Structures are given as C-alpha cells and as structure tokens.
Design a protein around this ligand. Structure first.
Ligand SMILES: [K+]
Ligand SMILES: [K+]
Length: 264
C-alpha cells in the first residue's frame, strides 16, 4: 500500500533505556537494510542516545551535517564542562557494528562496546559512577600522525582501530586527519574482530585464558584495578552484552553512518 506502510514494514522495534541502569522499556522504530543492518543514528536526532550514566545528552555532543559531533575543549581525559561519554542505550550481544569517524588534527576519541553502566560505593555508602572504560573494550580513534599517544604503548597498539593499549591494528591503514575512516566491530560468541577501511585489523577472544592474560598485562590488571579486572574479565556481565558508545577525550570528532546488524 502506502509509502508509510512499506516504511513500517522495513523497520524493527529497538528497545532503549532512558537513564542510569534503567530497564529498556521503550522502543524506537528503526530502519533495517536487506543485509540486516539497523541504522541507529538517523542523521537528525539523538533518539535512543544519552550520556553514559545520564538521563540526557550532554550539550558537548551535537548533531551537525548528518553527523554526531563531540565538541572538545582540549583537556584529554578531564571530561570538563557538559561532556562525558555517549551511549546508544540498547544492549547488544552478538552484533556487527559499522560506522565512520573523522578526527581533528591531533584528535583522539574512541568507540566503546559491550559497555555496562557501573557504580561503586564511596566511603559514605553513596553510589559513584565508574568510567565506561572499566567495562567496555575500546576501539581507538586517533590522528595517528599527530597525537603523541600514537607513539606510546607497544607495537603501535594505541593507534586507530587498535584494542587500546592491548592489541595493535595490523595493517595500520588509517586515512589521515580530516578524512573519513570506516570502523567495524564484530562480536560473535566471544570472537571479536576490529576492521578499519574495509580490512580486518585484529582478532581476539573474550572470556579465555588469553583474554585474562592480556588484562593482567594491562592497566586494568587484578592488582592495579580489581573492579576493572572483574568487569572486563567477564566482559558484558552475566548476560555477555552491553552498549556501543563513543568517547569524550576532549577533542573534536565526527561520527556518521552508524549501523548495527544483530547476529545469531
Ligand atoms: K535522547
Ligand atoms: K581514545
């Protein structure tokens, strides 16, 4: 029948949550292509998106020219002002995400996945929000030629599309600052693959001895950061699932064409 009815036919109900650790008790009708990718950013609104830990989108995240933009002040991990990491508030388990990203000269951001909203108790019994990165693996987003982090870590494991500070992207086929790069993150039954610019650049396996050993060699080791170790070692929590999101690392960055295929 109508264009409206055909559109409703080529759409799927996608649950989302509205605030810290809330149930996903509302749904968006989102477009799906023939390959099964759900477009999760519509080019115009933040529907389904919110700050990690928040009930709203921080004002440092804007929409511009069909992109999600983070507007940075230059303070790295500080997350000053009305910032913070952004999530699409729908937990995925087995999925393939594709999106494009572009950084400013010298810029740094990241794509998080399998994220959990985590709090801990302070000395007075009050809940405190823990960083997204103590639960969520990080796909690096970087100007590999100008941000000095590119030269740090080991074997270029802090360059774009790396599992940040843990496993390097090989080949390192990033395009330079100001150009669009294509990211792929696939999680399927614990196998994780990163892609960049239509090439697979690393592979790893969650919930294995090898994964534990990698974490024990990281800043999230059991000795250095017990809570992070516990969360990452059983990445995704009891149900092995979580949110996709993007990082406030204080620098201008743009994201577009954000789509996710649910794998079974
Ligand atoms: K929203
Ligand atoms: K980063």
């Amino acid at each position: 029948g109508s264009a409206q009815e055909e559109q409703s036919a080529n759409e799927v109900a996608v649950s989302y949550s509205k605030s810290l650790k809330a149930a996903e008790m509302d749904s968006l009708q989102l477009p799906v292509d023939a390959d099964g990718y759900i477009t999760i950013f519509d080019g115009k609104t933040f529907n389904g998106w919110r700050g990690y830990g928040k009930d709203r989108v921080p004002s440092k995240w804007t929409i511009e020219d069909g992109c999600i933009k983070f507007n940075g002040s230059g303070g790295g991990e500080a997350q000053d002002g009305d910032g913070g990491d952004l999530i699409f508030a729908h937990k995925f388990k087995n999925f393939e995400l594709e999106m494009e990203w572009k950084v400013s000269k010298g810029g740094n951001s990241g794509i998080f996945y399998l994220a959990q909203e985590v709090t801990s108790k302070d000395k007075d019994g009050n809940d405190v929000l823990e960083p997204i990165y103590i639960s969520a693996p990080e796909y690096q987003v970087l100007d590999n030629d100008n941000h000095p982090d590119a030269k740090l870590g080991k074997d270029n494991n802090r360059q774009s599309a790396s599992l940040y500070d843990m496993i390097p992207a090989v080949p390192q086929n990033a395009k330079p600052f100001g150009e669009w790069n294509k990211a792929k993150i696939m999680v399927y039954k614990g196998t994780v693959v990163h892609g960049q610019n239509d090439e697979n650049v690393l592979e790893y396996h969650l919930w294995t001895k090898q994964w534990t050993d990698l974490l024990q060699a990281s800043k999230f080791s059991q000795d250095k950061w017990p809570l992070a170790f516990e969360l990452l070692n059983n990445c995704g929590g009891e149900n092995h699932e979580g949110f996709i999101g993007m990082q406030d690392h204080g620098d201008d960055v743009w994201f577009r064409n954000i789509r996710v295929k649910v794998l079974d």
